[PDB]
Amino acid sequence: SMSNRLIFDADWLVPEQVQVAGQAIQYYAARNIQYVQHPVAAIQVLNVFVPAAYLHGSSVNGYQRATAPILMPNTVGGYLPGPADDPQRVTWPTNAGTIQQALKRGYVVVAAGIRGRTTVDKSGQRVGQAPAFIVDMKAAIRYVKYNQGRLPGDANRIITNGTSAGGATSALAGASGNSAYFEPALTALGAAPATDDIFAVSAYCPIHNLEHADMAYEWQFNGINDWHRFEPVSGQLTVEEQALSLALKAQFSTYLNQLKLTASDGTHLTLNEAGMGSFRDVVRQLLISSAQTAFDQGTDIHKYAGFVVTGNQVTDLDLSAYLKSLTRMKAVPAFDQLDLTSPENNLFGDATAKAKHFTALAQTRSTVTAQLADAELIQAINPLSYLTSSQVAKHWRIRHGAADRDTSFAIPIILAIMLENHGYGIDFALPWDIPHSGDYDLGDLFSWIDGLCQ
Numbered sequence: 001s002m003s004n005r006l007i008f009d010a011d012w013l014v015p016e017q018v019q020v021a022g023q024a025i026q027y028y029a030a031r032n033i034q035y036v037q038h039p040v041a042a043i044q045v046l047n048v049f050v051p052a053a054y055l056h057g058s059s060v061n062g063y064q065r066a067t068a069p070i071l072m073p074n075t076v077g078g079y080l081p082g083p084a085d086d087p088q089r090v091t092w093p094t095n096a097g098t099i100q101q102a103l104k105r106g107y108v109v110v111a112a113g114i115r116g117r118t119t120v121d122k123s124g125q126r127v128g129q130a131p132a133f134i135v136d137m138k139a140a141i142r143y144v145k146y147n148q149g150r151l152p153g154d155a156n157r158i159i160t161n162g163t164s165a166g167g168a169t170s171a172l173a174g175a176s177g178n179s180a181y182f183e184p185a186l187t188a189l190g191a192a193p194a195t196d197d198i199f200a201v202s203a204y205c206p207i208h209n210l211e212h213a214d215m216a217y218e219w220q221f222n223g224i225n226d227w228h229r230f231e232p233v234s235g236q237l238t239v240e241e242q243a244l245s246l247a248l249k250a251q252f253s254t255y256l257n258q259l260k261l262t263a264s265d266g267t268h269l270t271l272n273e274a275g276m277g278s279f280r281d282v283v284r285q286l287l288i289s290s291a292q293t294a295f296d297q298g299t300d301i302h303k304y305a306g307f308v309v310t311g312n313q314v315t316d317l318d319l320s321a322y323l324k325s326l327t328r329m330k331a332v333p334a335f336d337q338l339d340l341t342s343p344e345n346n347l348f349g350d351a352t353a354k355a356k357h358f359t360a361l362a363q364t365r366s367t368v369t370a371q372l373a374d375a376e377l378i379q380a381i382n383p384l385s386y387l388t389s390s391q392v393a394k395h396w397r398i399r400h401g402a403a404d405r406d407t408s409f410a411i412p413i414i415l416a417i418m419l420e421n422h423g424y425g426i427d428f429a430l431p432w433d434i435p436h437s438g439d440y441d442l443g444d445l446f447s448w449i450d451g452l453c454q
C-alpha cells in the first residue's frame with residue numbers, strides 16, 4: 001500500500017556468515033523488502049546483503065560503506081520469474097555462489113525478485129509477461145537510488161548482472177536508463193521517485209534482440225538440418241522448416257546491412273546475398289581469438305572441427321565445419337515459433353493471450369490463430385533500440401560461450417559492435433568451449449569491476 005514509504009533502514013541488517021573456499025565470509029542481510037508500494041505478485045521483493053566491515057567503520061578491497069559497488073544480479077532464466085536471491089540459497093534458480101564471492105570482494109549486493117511469464121496475481125491473472133521483468137528490475141534500481149546513503153554502497157555505481165534472459169535483463173537496464181516508455185508502469189506500481197540509469201552492465205549470453213534472432217540463427221545454422229536440445233530431444237528439419245531457414249538466412253543480410261556497423265579502422269561491416277562478407281569475418285576472427293586463448297593454455301581445440309593451426313598459432317577457421325560439430329540446438333523458427341510454443345512467444349503474451357508472435361514472418365506463416373505483439377513493446381525491450389531516448393551505462397562487459405548454441409554468435413556481437421561504434425566502453429569475448437551458462441569467470445569479472453570503481 002501507500003503506507004510503504006520505501007525508506008530503507010540499516011537497522012534491518014542482521015549478521016550472518018557463509019563458509020566459502022577455506023574462509024568464513026561475514027555479512028549482514030535484510031530480506032524480503034517490498035520495493036514498490038503496489039506490488040502485483042509476491043515475488044516482488046528484494047534482498048540486501050552487506051559486507052560486515054561496512055557496519056563496523058571498516059573497508060573491504062579498497063571500498064567502504066559509501067563507495068562500494070552495488071551488484072544487482074538477477075535469477076531470471078528463460079524469461080521465467082526470478083526469485084530474490086540469497087547467498088544461503090540452494091534451490092534452483094540461484095547465483096548464491098556469486099553473491100558469496102561478491103561479498104568477499106566487498107560489493108554490496110541487492111538481489112531483486114522479478115516477475116516472469118508464468119507469474120500470476122491474486123485472481124490468477126498473468127501479470128509477469130513483457131515488459132514486467134524490466135519494469136521490476138527498474139523498480140528495484142529506483143528503490144536503491146532513492147535510498148542512496150541509507151543503503152550501504154554507492155548508488156552511482158550500480159552494476160547489473162545476469163545470464164541468458166537474465167543477461168538481456170541486465171543489458172536492457174543498462175541501455176534504457178530513465179526511458180519514458182516505462183514511466184506509466186512504474187507509476188502504476190508506486191516505485192520510488194528516483195532515476196534508474198545504472199553505472200555498468202555485466203551480461204552472460206544475453207538472449208535479446210528477439211525480433212531479429214530468428215534471422216541471425218538461420219544465417220548461422222542453415223545447412224545443418226538436424227537439431228539437438230529435462231529430456232534429450234531431437235529432430236530433423238522439414239522442407240518447410242528448410243524453406244524458412246534459407247529465407248531467414250537471406251533476410252539476415254538485409255537487416256545486418258542496414259545497421260551500418262563498422263570495424264575499428266572504419267569499414268562498414270556487411271554481408272552479401274549469400275551471407276558472406278566482412279561481418280562474417282568478424283564472427284570468425286572472434287572464434288579464432290577464443291581458440292587461440294585456449295590453445296595457449298594447452299587445451300585441445302580440435303574437440304571441434306574447422307580450426308587451422310599453423311605452428312603455435314590458430315591462423316584460420318572453417319566456420320561451417322565448426323558449426324556442424326557445435327551442432328544446431330533449435331528448430332525453425334528458433335525464437336518466434338509458428339505454433340506459439342517458445343518461451344519468447346509466451347513472454348510476448350498478455351493477460352488475454354498466453355503467447356504472441358513478434359515478427360512479420362511467423363505471424364504470416366502462423367500455424368495457430370495468433371496476434372502480433374505491439375511494435376513499441378518489442379522495440380522497448382530490445383537493448384539495441386536505445387543505442388540507435390535514455391541515458392545509457394558507459395561500461396559494458398559481455399560474454400557468450402563459444403559452445404553456446406542458444407542464440408547465434410551474431411547477436412552478442414552486434415550488441416558489442418554498436419556499443420563500440422557509439423563510444424561506450426565494451427569488454428567482449430566468446431569464452432572457449434563454454435556452454436549456455438554464466439558467472440564462470442568471476443575472477444575476471446570482479447577485476448573488471450574493480451578497474452571501473454577504484
Ligand SMILES: CCOC(=O)c1cc(O)c(O)c(O)c1
Binds near residue numbers: 079165
Ligand atoms: C535455458 C537458460 O537460458 C535462458 O534463460 C534462455 C532464455 C531464452 O529466452 C532462450 O531462448 C534460451 O534459449 C535460453
